[PDB]
Each structure stands twice: as structure tokens, then as C-alpha cells.
């Protein structure tokens, strides 16, 4: 194989193009270029494969400069669901495979575009008892940060998005909840 | 297909563990790999037929075997809290190696002692009244709190249906208590639906928990419930 590098991790909102470059500038003349796409709680997935041409398909384009020392993944209008990591690996192929060296991958994020953010907290009592409650931070804009909890005794959780697929509505939201009843749901997020 | 034998272990240090690969492909590649935070996807092990095994980047600590083709075995002689991993394997076709299709996962957590296994508790927080009118939707969140390993997965049912649209449940747990190595979690969702639904006082909303925890074959000897593999569901019916 080839020794591959690629960013880290990477932004990105739903519906735009996302472009992945990968540099491997050691690629011998019978290394192919492979990546593959790992959905969380899910293994791999081969998703394209490339030799000195541009190859489409369903999934992605992949785009290889003359001297095939870098490659870019370019992911079409990108869906929620494309949050992922997605893997760039240059070797031999076929009867000839040997081993992958998947390494890290590119960590994409694909964020939502909130049509009309309407941000509020709000508290929600147990159905249980009232004893206790939760605090609900929600349909704020996707650039909006949720800071982790300073406090050992609070919890906020990270930003969640949801999918009321028939309303065609997304909507932000993270929890927040204590140990404590004195704690207000008013400065919770704050 | 490709199966790995089970989803979520949990085992004691020292204990002979053994995870399998299965697929009926008549694949001659097969692969064992973990995949850790920080770390990505770690090759331990392939095998390129019947009775052939190769080491791979990080073989310490595993051996293997193949004695059917269809069977590709990851062993773990006597386990260490340091294989605690997610593990997948993977198989492939000789004529297409580059192409592997892996299995599913395997979350093995190994403890030096059992004595911290807990069972989540689970309760429904109920719709705001501010949201309700505000935005004529209904957000119900479920906590799952105060288990330990982190093996839960949690999914809401609606009128025994499960229901996935409008759902959202944390990707990563919290530890409850920071600072202490074997901190208990605590993990959150939420389920949104219409204002009008919630307020159906026929609509049955459960958010069901399951724990991947003790076998018949652990001992367990505290006065609190044997922490088993189980399913624990908080719940709420529509109010108008």
C-alpha cells in the first residue's frame, strides 16, 4: 500500500456539495485509489474506486489529478445521513490485494438548515412524579453551540437533530437535567 | 451477509473469550479488526483460506483460527480491561479483495471485577405546555440513567409500534460521575409529534431500554437484582 492523508475531520450542511481530498503521493503504477463510507454503528462500506480517471456513481465522484499524487471524494448533495467517516486507501486490488491500512478517516459532520429557528427552553415534569424534571433547549439554528456541563453534579447532553420526516421539518435540541431542584431550567443552557 | 456471534459482551479479566465471524459466501478472506477513540479502524487478524491465518498491524494479545471456510475465529486467551473494543470483522471474495463486506459489530467490555454492572433506570418526561401552544408540537424526552458498561439501546414505541420519525437519541453517553473511572451513564432522547397526538389520551408512548449485562453463567451475590441482560421502558399515555 500507499501511505494515505486526509483532514481529520470535516463541516458541512445538508444539501451542499462536500469534497474530501486525499494526498498519497507515493502511489506506485498498480495502486488503485479506494474509499470507503462507515455509517455510525456500522462497519465500512466500499463506496468508489478510481485507477487515473473520473468515476461516478451512485454514491460519489471521485477526481484524480494527471500525476495521481492526491484524489478528491466529492459527496452530492449531502443528507444528514451522510454523517460518517470516510476512508481513503491506495494499494493493490484484486487477486493481488493484500491488506487495507484504514486508519482515522475523515470525520464529516452534516448539519441541518433550520427554515424558520424558533429557539426556546422549555421544562418537562416526569410522567412518573413531578418529583423530578428535565430541561429541553430546542429549534435554535445549527450554529448555535451547546456548551458541556462545568458542573459535575449538571448534565447537558451534546445537540441531537430530529426528523419529523412527513412535516419535512427538522428541528436542534439538547437536555439538560440535575440532581438538584433548585436548578433552573431558566440559566440551564446559559 | 456477514454475522458477528454476538452484538455485546461483557466479561472478566482472565476469561478465555471467544468472538466469531460467519459468512456462507464461500469468501476465502476474512478479517478481524477493533476500532477505538482516537485509534480508527486497527487490522488484528486476516486469513486468506481454510487453515491460513496472517498476523496483522496489532496481533498482540489475539490468535485466530480457521477450520471452515465460512468461519473466521478471534480469540482472546485470557482477556484484559485493554481489549474492552468495538470489534468488527470483515470478509472478502479472492478475485475481489479490495472489496470487503463487513459484519455488524461486537462491543466487548471486559471489567476486573463484576461488582459495577448496573441496569439502567428509565423514566418519560412529558410534553411541555409551552411547547404545545407555542409551536402545536410535543417534544417527550426519555432519560436512561445510572448503567454501567455503557451497553444500552434504547428506541421509543408508539401503540406497541416502534416508531423512528421524529426521533432523536444521544450518539455518546454522559458519565454521571466525571471523575470516577468506573462512573455509571446516562443517556437521553427525545421524541417529537404532533400537539394533537400527545393530547390523545388512547396514544401509548414507551421508550424502551435494553441493557446487555450479566449471563446465567455469572455469579452474582449482592442483595441487589442480578444485573442481567434485560429490558427496562418508562412510559406515558396521551393527556388531554
Known amino acids: 500500500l500507499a501511505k494515505t492523508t486526509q483532514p481529520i475531520s470535516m463541516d458541512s450542511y445538508e444539501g451542499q456539495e462536500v469534497n474530501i481530498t486525499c494526498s498519497h503521493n507515493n502511489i506506485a503504477t498498480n495502486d488503485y485509489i479506494t474509499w470507503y463510507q462507515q455509517f455510525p454503528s456500522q462497519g465500512p462500506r466500499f463506496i468508489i474506486q478510481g485507477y487515473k480517471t473520473k468515476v461516478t456513481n451512485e454514491v460519489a465522484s471521485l477526481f484524480i489529478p494527471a500525476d495521481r499524487k492526491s484524489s478528491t471524494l466529492s459527496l452530492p448533495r449531502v443528507s444528514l445521513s451522510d454523517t460518517a467517516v470516510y476512508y481513503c486507501?491506495?494499494?493493490?486490488?484484486?487477486?493481488?490485494?493484500?491488506?487495507?491500512?484504514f486508519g482515522s478517516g475523515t470525520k464529516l459532520n452534516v448539519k441541518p438548515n433550520i427554515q424558520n429557528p424558533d429557539p426556546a427552553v422549555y421544562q418537562l415534569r416526569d410522567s412518573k412524579s413531578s418529583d423530578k424534571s428535565v430541561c429541553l433547549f430546542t429549534d435554535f439554528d445549527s450554529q448555535t453551540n451547546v456548551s458541556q456541563s462545568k458542573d459535575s453534579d449538571v448534565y447537558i447532553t451534546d445537540k441531537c437533530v430530529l426528523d419529523m420526516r412527513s412535516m419535512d421539518f427538522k428541528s436542534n435540541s439538547a437536555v439538560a437535567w440535575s440532581n438538584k431542584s433548585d436548578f433552573a431550567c431558566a440559566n440551564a443552557f446559559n | 451477509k456477514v454475522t458477528q456471534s454476538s452484538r455485546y459482551l461483557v466479561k472478566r479479566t482472565g476469561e478465555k473469550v471467544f468472538l466469531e465471524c460467519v459468512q456462507d459466501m464461500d469468501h476465502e478472506n476474512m478479517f478481524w479488526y477493533r476500532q477505538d477513540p482516537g485509534l480508527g479502524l486497527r487490522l488484528i487478524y486476516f486469513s486468506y483460506d481454510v487453515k491460513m491465518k496472517e498476523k496483522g498491524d496489532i496481533p498482540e494479545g489475539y490468535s485466530v483460527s480457521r477450520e471452515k471456510k465460512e468461519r473466521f475465529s478471534l480469540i482472546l486467551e485470557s482477556a484484559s480491561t485493554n481489549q474492552t473494543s468495538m470489534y468488527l470483522c470483515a470478509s472478502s471474495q479472492r478475485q475481489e479483495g479490495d472489496t470487503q463486506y463487513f459484519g455488524p459489530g461486537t462491543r466487548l467490555t471486559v471489567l476486573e471485577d463484576l461488582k459495577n454492572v448496573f441496569p439502567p433506570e428509565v423514566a418519560v418526561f412529558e410534553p411541555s405546555e409551552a411547547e404545545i401552544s407555542h409551536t402545536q408540537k410535543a417534544t417527550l424526552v426519555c432519560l436512561a440513567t445510572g448503567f454501567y458498561p455503557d451497553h444500552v439501546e434504547l428506541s421509543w414505541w408508539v401503540n406497541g409500534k416502534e416508531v423512528h420519525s421524529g426521533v432523536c437519541t444521544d450518539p455518546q453517553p454522559l458519565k454521571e460521575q466525571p471523575a470516577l473511572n468506573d462512573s455509571r451513564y446516562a443517556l437521553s432522547s427525545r421524541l417529537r409529534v404532533s400537539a394533537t397526538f400527545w393530547q390523545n389520551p388512547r396514544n401509548h408512548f414507551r421508550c424502551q431500554v435494553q441493557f446487555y449485562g450479566l449471563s446465567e453463567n455469572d455469579e452474582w451475590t449482592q442483595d441487589r437484582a442480578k444485573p442481567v441482560t434485560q429490558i427496562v421502558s418508562a412510559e406515558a399515555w396521551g393527556r388531554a
Open positions: 486507501l491506495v494499494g493493490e486490488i484484486l487477486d493481488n490485494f493484500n491488506k487495507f491500512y
